[PDB]
Amino acid sequence: GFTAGLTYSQLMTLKDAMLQLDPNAKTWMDIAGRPEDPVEIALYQPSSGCYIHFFREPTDLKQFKQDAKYSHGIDVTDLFATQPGLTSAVIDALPRNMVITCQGSDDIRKLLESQGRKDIKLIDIALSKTDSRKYENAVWDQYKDLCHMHTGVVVEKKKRGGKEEITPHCALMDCIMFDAAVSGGLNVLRAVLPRDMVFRTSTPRVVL
RNA sequence: GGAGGGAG
RNA sequence: CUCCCUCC
Ligand SMILES: [Mg+2]
Ligand SMILES: [Zn+2]
Numbered sequence: 001g002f003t004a005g006l007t008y009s010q011l012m013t014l015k016d017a018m019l020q021l022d023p024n025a026k027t028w029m030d031i032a033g034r035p036e037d038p039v040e041i042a043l044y045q046p047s048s049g050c051y052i053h054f055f056r057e058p059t060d061l062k063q064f065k066q067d068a069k070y071s072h073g074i075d076v077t078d079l080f081a082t083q084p085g086l087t088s089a090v091i092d093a094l095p096r097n098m099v100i101t102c103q104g105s106d107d108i109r110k111l112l113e114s115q116g117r118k119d120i121k122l123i124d125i126a127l128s129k130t131d132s133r134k135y136e137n138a139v140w141d142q143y144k145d146l147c148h149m150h151t152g153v154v155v156e157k158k159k160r161g162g163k164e165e166i167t168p169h170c171a172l173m174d175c176i177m178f179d180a181a182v183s184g185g186l187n188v189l190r191a192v193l194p195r196d197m198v199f200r201t202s203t204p205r206v207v208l
Numbered sequence: 209g210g211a212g213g214g215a216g
Numbered sequence: 217c218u219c220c221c222u223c224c
Contacts, residue, residue, distance in 0.1 A: 034216065034219080063216090066217045071216040104215045106220060129214070155217095169216070 003092065005085030010197065015093055017192050020050060023095040028175040029102050032072040033058065035110035039074060040149070041087060042171035043100075046179045049189045052090065053172045054198040055082045055149070073152025073168040081200035091115040101125060103132055103178055125182055135180035139173050142186065147172055 003011055021027075025045045032040035037060050043052040057079045058064035068074050091112065097119045102108045105124035112120050125132075150168045158164040180186050 032216065039216095063218070067216045067219095070217055104220085107215060110220095126214090 003085065003089055006083065006089055011089065014089060014193070014197065017194070017197070018052070018090070018093040020048075020192050021045065021052075021095070022048060023098060026179075027098065027100050028179060029100045029108055030171040030174040030178070031107060031111065032074065032169055032171050033067065034060075034063065035107045035114065037063065038087065038111060039064065039079065040072065040171045041090070042175045044172070044175035044179065046176075046183070046187045049187065050192050051172065051175070051189055052192045053146070054086055054090070054193060055079055056087050057082055068152050069155060071154065071169050073150040073154045075151045078149055078151065081202045083198060083200065086198070088115060091117060094120065097121065099123060101178075101182075103127055103174070125178065127178075127181065132174075132178050132181050135177040135186070136167055136173075138186060139177040139180060140167060143173065143176060143189075146189065 006014070022045060025047045028042075028044035028046075030042055031038045033056075037058050039056055039058055041052075041054055041056065045051070058076065061076060064076060068076075092115065094117065099121045100108065101123040103125055105122045109122055112118070112122075147170045150170055152168065154166050154168040155163040156166050176189075
């Protein structure tokens with residue numbers, strides 16, 4: 001009937017903010033979290049340099065906790081004030097019949113089809129782990145200030161020894177670094193959404 | 209159950 | 217840690 005949790009004022013603000021997108025530009029999307037219970041969400045257009053990055057709190061904290069140690073290293077403490085509903089809102093604003101590019105389209109497909117957008121055409125570059133990540137450290141370097149949200153230490157099976165430490169999976173960096181791979185190098189970036197749209201400024205209060 | 213991949 | 221895909 002309506003769009004949950006967002007008032008009309010900020011919902012129009014959003015819709016205007018997302019008209020800054022070129023419907024026909026190359027458009028990247030990655031997520032952190034399960035498609036059922038996503039936590040981080042990024043969309044990227046290298047052509048303009050503009051991106052949509054925001055956050056959601058997990059409903060399953062158990063599944064979230066494993067995912068953080070072996071994938072994203074996100075501290076649930078840092079999702080503390082995030083716009084409820086934002087995901088459904090942003091997905092709904094995406095242009096009818098859009099073309100998204102991603103890696104491992106199966107997660108992205110599951111999410112969009114759960115938002116009712118079957119109309120969105122998905123292009124999976126279908127790379128390999130070692131190909132796609134080839135621009136990782138440079139992307140993380142030039143672009144570090146854009147995500148401070150992966151605090152955690154992320155690990156991997158060492159063939160000899162069990163845990164080997166790595167660089168975690170940020171929807172945003174992945175978006176950027178996959179483009180770099182598919183375009184053979186690095187492409188200035190601007191957020192489509194205002195900070196107080198993706199995060200509530202929490203105020204001091206008396207507890208009741 | 210194995211072989212390989214991919215995702216969080 | 218957990219999910220997905222392909223193959224026998
Ligand atoms: Mg992905
Ligand atoms: Zn991130």
